Amino acid sequence: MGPGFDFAQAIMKKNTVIARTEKGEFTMLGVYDRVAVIPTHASVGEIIYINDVETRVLDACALRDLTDTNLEITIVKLDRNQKFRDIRHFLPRCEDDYNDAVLSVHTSKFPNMYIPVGQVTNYGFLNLGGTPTHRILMYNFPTRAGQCGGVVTTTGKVIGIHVGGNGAQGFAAMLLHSYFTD
């Protein structure tokens, strides 16, 4: 509908896949080569479904900060026959607040879903499902079950992936350029 939705649609149409684990279906952001991200609570194993194709997981790493605190991001390398468009240049370098973000979701249940979530706070610490978690972004939108893995964008930046909510607010794990240095 506007330049925010334009940037979000460009990311969704080329850099997402539908990931299915034993814990359900997630929006999964592909970042470069065969490297993607997903919320750590997806519990990625040795085999994952990617757009309903049985796919070997070559590596999975649940990220923690240097205080050894959960970040709720898992980086997956997929045994896929095709690379992702490299979008690393759209990742922020530092922790930050943002204006006017869009949360975008694409699953069997919620195809082509785009949400204007508005102002994004660098919230920091959250007790997420009883797990102390750092580098959390907050937005005042009543997000719900099925939106985990959703991509959070501003114009020009891919800033986070949706990981939870409390019924009034939604919470995203930051994406930083330093996670995807090769």
Curated annotation (Swiss-Prot):
It catalyses: Selective cleavage of Gln-|-Gly bond in the poliovirus polyprotein. In other picornavirus reactions Glu may be substituted for Gln, and Ser or Thr for Gly. Disulfide bonds: none annotated. Residues 2-180 form the Peptidase C3 domain. It is found in: Host cytoplasm. It comes from the Viruses. The active site is at 41 (for protease 3c activity), 72 (for protease 3c activity), 148 (for protease 3c activity). Interacts with host IFIH1/MDA5; this interaction inhibits host IFIH1. Major viral protease that mediates proteolytic processing of the polyprotein. Cleaves host EIF5B, contributing to host translation shutoff. Also cleaves host PABPC1, contributing to host translation shutoff. Binds and inhibits host IFIH1/MDA5, thereby inhibiting the type-I IFN production and the establishment of the antiviral state. Cleaves host MAP3K7/TAK1, resulting in inhibition of TRAF6-triggered NF-kappa-B induction. Cleaves host TICAM1; this interaction allows the virus to disrupt host TLR3 signaling. Cleaves host IRF7, resulting in inhibition of type-I IFN production. This is Protease 3C. The lineage of its organism: Viruses, Riboviria, Orthornavirae, Pisuviricota, Pisoniviricetes. The chain holds residues 1549 to 1729 of 2188 of the full protein.
